[PDB]
Write a structure and sequence with these properties.
The structure is cut from a larger assembly and holds chains A, B, C and D. Helix content of chain B is 25%, strand content 14%. Chain B is built from 2 helices and 3 strands; from the N terminus they run αβββα. Chain D is elongated. Chain D has strands at 29-31, 44-46, 50-53, 57-60, 63-71, 75-81. The chains are: A mainly beta, B alpha+beta, C alpha+beta, D mainly beta. Chain C binds chain D through residues 78, 80-82, 85-87, and chain D through 1-4, 6-9, 11. The structure holds 3 RNA strands. The PDB classes it as ribosome/antibiotic.
Chain lengths: 185, 99, 141, 84
RNA sequence: UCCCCCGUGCCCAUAGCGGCGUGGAACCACCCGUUCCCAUUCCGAACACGGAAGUGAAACGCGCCAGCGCCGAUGGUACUGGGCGGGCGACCGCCUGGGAGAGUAGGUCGGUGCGGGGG
RNA sequence: AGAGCGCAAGGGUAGAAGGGGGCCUGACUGCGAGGCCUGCAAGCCGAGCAGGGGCGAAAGCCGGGCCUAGUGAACCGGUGGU
RNA sequence: UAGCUGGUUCUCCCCGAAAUGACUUUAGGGUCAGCCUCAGGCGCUGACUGGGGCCUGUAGAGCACUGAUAGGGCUAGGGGGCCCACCAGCCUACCAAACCCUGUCAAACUCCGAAGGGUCCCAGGUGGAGCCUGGGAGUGAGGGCGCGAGCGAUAACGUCCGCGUCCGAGCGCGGGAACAACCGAGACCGCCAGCUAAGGCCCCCAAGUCUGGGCUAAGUGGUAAAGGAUGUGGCGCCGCGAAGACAGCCAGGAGGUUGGCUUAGAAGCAGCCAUCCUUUAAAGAGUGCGUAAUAGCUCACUGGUCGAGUGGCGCCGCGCCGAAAAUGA
């Protein structure tokens, strides 16, 4: 959705940050300049739209331009967000990480077993004109001891792939019990 | 496949690059430092004689005397595939003193 | 009680630890996360004591996953022998963990299971720590 | 004082090293015979009027000044401005 | 004078790879015969000698999916010659000068010196 | 270039040092500008000079082996030559 | 005879260092360097930096090197079963190479790579600089503190190197109450001259009971923690709520159901497996209590009565406890 923005100049990080803002550096193919936004609404809004969806940041320079983030670079010590980078919107064969929602209640589950998800945001491609929001996929007939993955996922028509694709998406695993302390021996 | 810088042996301190293939001899005098050559003479691309053995011989010498009007002294034989078969051009009579 | 296996050499020097962690601060594996937080060593006793608290209270639950690995030669010396000769031997197989270094993640439980487990677990460690969820550590390889 | 049988080590050793490395820098006027570099492997292949001795020693062959050149798959090469 | 292929040096993997196109008259790979050369821990597969038969495929330069590869800034931290300050410890923070790798967009299947074969 | 390069390690090298062979025998005599190191002693490299060899047709290569321990000042005596 | 000891005396001035490296039947003895100083003889050269050229593999980082790797996954082979002796069909709650991807550990690992440092040429740089000589020396456990590696237990005012320096040689001066190296400052001598550094203005002791807006309630400040709390101010998130919240009251707070099951019996209630709906405004396969197990108090639910706020979470400061020794504070 919509967020603020401001053109950045030759100012240094800490200032913008420790004040109550956060700097960025947008680009797209033929672009690479520097920008920034405000903190509180950044933090808040990133919970919702995020890299899950598309951002439409408003520049006071006029153009309320829609882009996408990516690269965010934490401070790693007493940490939190500390420098988002921005790719800009196009229509070319672009790639990103689509969020997911695995739905249902299968057979490994219920008995006590537990799913091991290996991906929620996934490596795929599309044209930004498309809006393949967040893919909600299959978890009906699952069983412990087996795995599902690869090119076995649903496609909102058009969306091509970008992996190998035998990348393991998930697998159901046998839980942990204090009878593994019988192994403690 | 005769890398080995056999040319390092030829990177001694003077060169002379040539070649032999199908029906043609490719003989040329090269000075280096930048890789600036100098002299030329071929087998059939010269409308010389029509026999590889004989031609070879004198073609060397041909170029040699030409080089004598251009001013040289000593160099080194440059080639990758050879076994060395004299080819009594052997660019030796061919000015160089060769061998 | 796991470790490597007498690799290359067996005695290695002490250490002073300012702060960097080298990284390794996110989910990627499962879900709910326990995050270590001080400049110190992770004790094997506390490794499987955390594992205790876990499968202890939460039994027949779900699956828990690891990113860490305790391996350090605690150069210990014999007692009353008067100081000098030699370095010492590889006891206290601790690991090297600084502030902000996360480490433990649970999956397949209720929110509160994680919560309580992480409470008592934190009550055990030779220091203390924090805990959180899943939303803003997406993208970290 | 309850002092019991200790163990005895051996790890009290190392090597003793000279001043191994670039003896001369470039920009220095050299006088033929000056050893300019000590080295183990052929880390630096000797070059134009720069010679080598068994110990991979790159000394000065001529009168003048050190210079360097490197290409990818060839390595590190050194010459000296010659002067007549 | 704008200009087609090869002996061949330099640029350091954008030059390398699967593949995709490639030419042959001339160049080249060859082809061809072991008479000449001399050669093989055995084999003319390595190299010379000789051609009418004769190939463009396997080989090179040259034109490409750019999947792999390598090239990769922009911004920020990580620390830090230097200076000034708080700790049960362990640690830290402000200035000065710095600036990685990583994340990222992105880029290339070749850039080029001489000499000789020419529309 | 993860094989290997004589024994350990590092370096490094198939543009050899590794692996096959022909002829040989510079594992030269008397000097050596020059310097690295370096309190001293010591260790070390070295192109070029006259002698005069071996191979490569030559351009040229060899004043022991790819390198860093296998080495021990002095006093005293044996040895042949001069 | 003593590589070892006690003494070594009058005066002014100009100097000014060692505590480190080679070695020693040598370790507290001593030869060489090392800096001091003196006297003769030379001139930008000394530290330092701008510029520019060249060498490193350290912080940090990194899995592609050498090694460790948590996990899932999938995939080789077998162990192996059934299997056949004409040979092979086949299997794998197993052991599991590789690789994969999720992820990471490395003083003796490095694809990368700092600040830099070292030093070289031009230029700056008259200074108890720099060069040579020789004459005479002392000095060869240094140590404080910082910052960085180590045997050390992130113990010692153990500690061997490293850089750095003060003391040593400045236990000369001003602070630190008193304390060579924690900070300020090279003292040639006089001065009843003002400036001024450390720190200071409630005082002794020199200086504002200064001017101003918050914060603390213990004497925090006089110096402690892991952890614990309706101690207080300020920011901020979410809902119930004038259709009326919260809170106190009347009222149900049900039935299949005593759920299943086990169990001597297990009734929401010891426990394990466990999700239905119904008379509805409203009751949860039931929150704690209760019985031997029922029965029973219960609360969630819900309506009212009623009147204006209320309860929970995340955040930044100060105080609180955690806090017990041997002369008298």
């Amino acid at each position: 959705y919509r967020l603020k923005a401001y053109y950045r100049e030759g100012e240094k990080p800490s200032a913008l940050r420790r004040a109550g803002k956060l700097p960025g550096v947008m680009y797209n193919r033929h672009l690479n300049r520097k920008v920034y936004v405000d903190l509180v609404e950044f933090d808040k809004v990133f919970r919702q739209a995020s890299i899950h969806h598309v951002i439409v940041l408003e520049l006071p320079d006029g153009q309320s331009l829609p882009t996408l983030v990516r690269q965010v670079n934490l401070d790693k010590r007493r940490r939190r967000p500390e420098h988002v980078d921005f790719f800009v919107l196009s229509d070319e064969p672009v790639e990103m990480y689509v969020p997911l929602r695995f739905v249902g209640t299968p057979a490994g589950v219920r008995a006590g077993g537990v799913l091991q998800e290996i991906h929620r945001d996934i490596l795929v491609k599309v044209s930004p004109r498309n809006i393949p929001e967040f893919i909600e996929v299959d978890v009906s007939g699952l069983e412990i001891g087996d795995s599902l993955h690869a090119s076995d996922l649903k496609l909102p028509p058009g969306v091509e792939l970008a992996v190998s694709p035998e990348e393991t998406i998930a697998a159901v695993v046998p839980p942990e019990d204090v009878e593994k302390l019988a192994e403690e021996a | 496949k005769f890398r080995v810088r056999n040319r390092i042996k030829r990177t001694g301190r003077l060169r002379l690059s040539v070649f032999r293939s199908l029906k043609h001899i490719y003989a040329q005098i090269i000075d280096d430092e930048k890789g600036v050559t100098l002299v030329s003479a071929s087998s059939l691309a010269l409308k010389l004689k029509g026999n590889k053995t004989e031609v070879a011989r004198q073609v060397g010498r041909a170029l040699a005397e030409k080089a004598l009007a251009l001013g040289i002294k000593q160099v080194a034989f440059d080639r990758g595939p050879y076994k060395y078969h004299g080819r009594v051009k052997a660019l030796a009579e061919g000015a160089r003193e060769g061998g | 009680m796991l470790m490597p296996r007498r690799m290359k050499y067996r005695k290695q020097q002490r250490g002073r630890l300012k702060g960097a962690t080298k990284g390794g601060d996110y989910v990627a594996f499962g879900d709910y996360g326990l995050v270590a937080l001080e400049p110190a060593w992770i004790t094997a006793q506390q490794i499987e004591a955390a594992r205790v608290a876990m499968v202890r209270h939460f039994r027949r639950g779900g699956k828990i996953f690891i990113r860490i690995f305790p391996d350090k030669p605690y150069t210990k010396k014999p007692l009353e022998v008067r100081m000098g000769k030699g370095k010492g031997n590889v006891e206290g197989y601790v690991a090297v963990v600084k502030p902000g270094r996360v480490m433990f993640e649970v999956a397949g439980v209720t929110e509160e299971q994680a919560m309580e487990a992480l409470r008592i677990a934190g009550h055990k460690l030779p220091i203390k720590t924090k805990i959180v969820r899943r939303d803003a550590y997406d993208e970290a390889q | 004082a309850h002092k019991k049988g200790l163990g005895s080590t051996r790890n009290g050793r190392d090597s003793q090293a000279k001043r191994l490395g670039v003896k001369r820098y470039e920009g220095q006027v050299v006088r033929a015979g000056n050893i300019l570099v000590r080295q183990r492997g052929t880390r630096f292949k000797p070059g134009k009027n720069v010679g080598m001795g068994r110990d991979f020693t790159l000394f000065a062959l001529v009168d003048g000044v050190v210079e360097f050149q490197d290409r990818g798959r060839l390595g590190r090469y050194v010459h000296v401005r010659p002067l007549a």
